[PDB]
Amino acid sequence: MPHAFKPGDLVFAKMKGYPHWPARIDDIADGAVKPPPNKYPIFFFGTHETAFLGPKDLFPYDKSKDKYGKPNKRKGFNEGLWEIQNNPHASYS
Numbered sequence: 001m002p003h004a005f006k007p008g009d010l011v012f013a014k015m016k017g018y019p020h021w022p023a024r025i026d027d028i029a030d031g032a033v034k035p036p037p038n039k040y041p042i043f044f045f046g047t048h049e050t051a052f053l054g055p056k057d058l059f060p061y062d063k064s065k066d067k068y069g070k071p072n073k074r075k076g077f078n079e080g081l082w083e084i085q086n087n088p089h090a091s092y093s
């Protein structure tokens with residue numbers, strides 16, 4: 001049975017105006033800005049951007065990749081697909 005989201009989990013993350021996007025739940029570094037309550041720091045593969053999202057916009061990657069893991073024309077998306085498949089836990093700093 002599912003647990004709550006934790007750092008390192010792989011997802012497709014939905015934002016307004018954008019396709020479900022390959023991403024991961026990030027950790028929060030000592031001294032860094034924390035998310036709002038009930039929100040997680042989401043690192044978007046390919047764009048390397050961070051946004052804060054709640055579970056309603058988070059789709060676990062294994063269950064969802066057949067639907068959402070196809071090439072997209074949008075900037076960064078196909079790099080993102082490579083990252084989540086090939087090195088999803090690397091530093092992209």
Ligand SMILES: CN[C@H]1CCCN(c2cccnn2)C1
Nearest residue numbers: 015018021044047049050051
């Ligand atoms: C994939 N393009 C969007 C997706 C959602 C995350 N976006 C953010 C969030 C915070 C800052 N900059 N960009 C970029």
